[PDB]
Amino acid sequence: SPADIVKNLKESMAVLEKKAEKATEEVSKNLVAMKEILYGKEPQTEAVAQLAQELYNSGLLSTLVADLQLIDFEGKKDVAQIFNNILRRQIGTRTPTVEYICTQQNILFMLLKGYESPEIALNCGIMLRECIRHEPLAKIILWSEQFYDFFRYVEMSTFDIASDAFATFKDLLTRHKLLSAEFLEQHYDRFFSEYEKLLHSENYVTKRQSLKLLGELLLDRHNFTIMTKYISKPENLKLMMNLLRDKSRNIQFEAFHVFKVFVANPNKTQPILDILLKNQAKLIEFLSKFQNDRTFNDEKTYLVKQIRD
Amino acid sequence: HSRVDPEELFTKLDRIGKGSFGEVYKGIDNHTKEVVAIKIIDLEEAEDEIEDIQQEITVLSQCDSPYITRYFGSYLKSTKLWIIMEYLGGGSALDLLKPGPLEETYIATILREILKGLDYLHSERKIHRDIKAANVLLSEQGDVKLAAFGVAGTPFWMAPEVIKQYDFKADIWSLGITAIELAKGEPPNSDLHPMRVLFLIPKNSPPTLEGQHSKPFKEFVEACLNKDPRFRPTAKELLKHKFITRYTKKTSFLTELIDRYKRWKS
Numbered sequence: 001s002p003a004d005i006v007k008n009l010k011e012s013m014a015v016l017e018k019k020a021e022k023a024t025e026e027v028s029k030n031l032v033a034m035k036e037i038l039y040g041k042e043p044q045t046e047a048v049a050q051l052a053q054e055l056y057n058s059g060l061l062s063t064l065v066a067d068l069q070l071i072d073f074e075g076k077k078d079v080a081q082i083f084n085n086i087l088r089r090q091i092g093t094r095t096p097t098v099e100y101i102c103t104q105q106n107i108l109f110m111l112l113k114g115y116e117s118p119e120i121a122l123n124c125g126i127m128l129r130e131c132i133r134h135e136p137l138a139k140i141i142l143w144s145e146q147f148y149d150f151f152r153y154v155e156m157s158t159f160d161i162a163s164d165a166f167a168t169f170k171d172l173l174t175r176h177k178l179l180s181a182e183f184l185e186q187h188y189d190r191f192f193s194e195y196e197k198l199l200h201s202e203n204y205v206t207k208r209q210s211l212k213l214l215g216e217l218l219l220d221r222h223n224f225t226i227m228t229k230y231i232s233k234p235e236n237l238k239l240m241m242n243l244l245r246d247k248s249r250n251i252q253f254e255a256f257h258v259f260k261v262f263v264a265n266p267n268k269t270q271p272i273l274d275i276l277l278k279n280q281a282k283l284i285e286f287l288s289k290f291q292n293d294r295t296f297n298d299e300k301t302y303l304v305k306q307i308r309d
Numbered sequence: 310h311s312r313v314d315p316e317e318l319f320t321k322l323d324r325i326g327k328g329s330f331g332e333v334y335k336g337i338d339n340h341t342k343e344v345v346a347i348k349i350i351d352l353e354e355a356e357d358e359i360e361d362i363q364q365e366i367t368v369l370s371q372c373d374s375p376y377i378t379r380y381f382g383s384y385l386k387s388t389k390l391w392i393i394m395e396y397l398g399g400g401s402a403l404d405l406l407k408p409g410p411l412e413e414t415y416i417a418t419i420l421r422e423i424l425k426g427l428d429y430l431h432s433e434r435k436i437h438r439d440i441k442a443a444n445v446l447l448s449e450q451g452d453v454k455l456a457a458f459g460v461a462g463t464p465f466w467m468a469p470e471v472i473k474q475y476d477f478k479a480d481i482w483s484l485g486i487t488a489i490e491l492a493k494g495e496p497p498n499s500d501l502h503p504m505r506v507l508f509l510i511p512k513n514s515p516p517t518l519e520g521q522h523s524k525p526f527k528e529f530v531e532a533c534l535n536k537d538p539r540f541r542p543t544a545k546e547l548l549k550h551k552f553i554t555r556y557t558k559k560t561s562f563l564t565e566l567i568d569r570y571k572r573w574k575s
């Protein structure tokens with residue numbers, strides 16, 4: 001019975017936190033036991049419901065995530081599968097697990113802090129990227145101060161991680177569009193101040209990844225107000241024009257896919273127009289020789305037309 | 310920790326894998342002072358939607374077996390990605406063939422450990438995609454571990470169903486070619502052009518172990534080399550085969566081949 005399995009795993013975890021081993025053996029065997037309940041010979045419809053209800057009442061979910069470092073390798077992988085499975089569990093038009101995590105918010109903050117610990121950082125991302133698929137859970141993190149810790153995680157110089165914390169960073173700003181647009185609308189000044197540092201980063205991956213996301217964010221129909229405020233600032237145009245030049249090919253290529261938004265803007269401002277005319281000629285020539293192959297040039301013509309007019 | 314140039318903790322020394330793998334060095338961790346194998350891959354356009362690189366990395370972080378080369382972590386400064394992994398100073402199985410031929414006692418022992426490595430990968434629903442003697446390495450204690458790069462080609466060890474377009478049964482075929490490679494020193498149709506081989510594999514009959522070798526050996530190769538992937542045994546069934554179950558020599562017995570090479574090169 002699941003009720004016995006939960007209690008067996010709950011008591012063994014309290015041992016870890018020489019004479020260990022026995023607990024590690026019990027923990028490993030009980031984590032597998034839970035997995036076979038959720039997956040199977042096909043998982044039983046009541047076995048998963050007896051298990052999930054015992055996970056809520058015992059608070060084992062918050063326990064496993066907290067003491068995740070103490071678990072063995074295969075165990076950490078099993079915890080993720082057990083966690084993600086009950087997280088998707090639905091009862092009609094409701095999702096009981098999500099409603100539970102809303103009551104236990106530290107479970108989200110514990111997963112987020114997991115990026116600072118390499119031993120579990122990869123696992124803490126697989127579970128985190130599942131939670132933010134649900135809007136109530138993605139909202140807690142988005143308006144939290146721990147969300148700004150992502151700007152530190154994306155340049156953590158640990159490649160296997162870092163990117164994983166960036167995939168979560170994109171999924172928070174793109175999945176729930178009405179939720180993200182509301183956040184960017186209010187936290188515009190602070191977010192883009194932090195985001196500007198990613199575009200001046202000494203990291204080829206980080207710079208081009210942020211440059212790609214920046215293109216998607218502005219172009220999205222929900223972040224229209226954010227876009228119009230971005231393509232009106234003089235510096236934002238100066239930065240894109242600078243990235244169009246030296247260094248990488250893919251970077252100056254993606255700089256083009258954000259620079260065109262400034263030009264396509266039918267509601268230009270005087271400070272944005274004084275820049276396009278003081279550097280009037282050079283753009284027309286640079287675009288004609290802008291590189292240079294198999295995609296594109298139809299846009300490189302309409303832009304010239306705009307700067308010419 | 311966190312935001313630090315890879316050279317601050319890992320230093321480079323020589324250059325193993327004679328240009329074979331994508332620029333791999335021998336190095337030590339300045340803190341633990343223990344030896345590791347560092348692979349550096351350029352990123353600055355070279356490539357740059359080579360981003361799926363995480364595939365090789367994410368899978369490597371999911372691989373935990375004493376029969377597979379362990380992944381310690383990857384670091385990057387801007388360009389140049391450092392991939393640190395386990396160090397095996399016993400060389401590859403191909404390097405143990407350079408001194409001379411191998412007796413069936415050693416060959417049966419090696420294939421027993423390769424199957425264990427394949428048993429783990431297939432159970433994790435992962436495919437090695439490139440099984441050969443070059444990718445089979447040994448430590449100094451004689452522990453046989455498979456490679457790492459490519460887990461999820463190289464003609465001669467290919468399966469016919471792969472060339473026509475890579476289910477895990479293809480690794481069994483590549484193992485069958487390797488079985489011949491361990492007994493001949495080279496795969497079947499080795500002196501042919503690799504492109505011609507790609508055209509002959511799906512059309513012709515599967516290769517066969519010919520010569521003065523035992524029948525359980527010749528039956529083992531026959532079992533793996535089956536043009537119908539459905540008839541090819543698993544990595545668990547072959548661990549119970551006649552050729553494998555006979556010789557029960559431990560992995561430490563493979564230290565003789567390690568020593569034979571370190572004297573050959575003199």
Ligand SMILES: CCN(CC)CCNC(=O)c1c(C)[nH]c(/C=C2\C(=O)Nc3ccc(Cl)cc32)c1C
Nearest residue numbers: 325326346378394395396397398400404456457
């Ligand atoms: C005297 C060595 N002899 C002639 C060169 C043959 C052994 N070759 C090596 O120098 C060598 C060494 C010391 N290590 C390796 C390969 C290693 C290695 O050392 N670690 C490691 C991890 C993962 C993978 Cl896929 C491959 C490797 C190779 C090819």
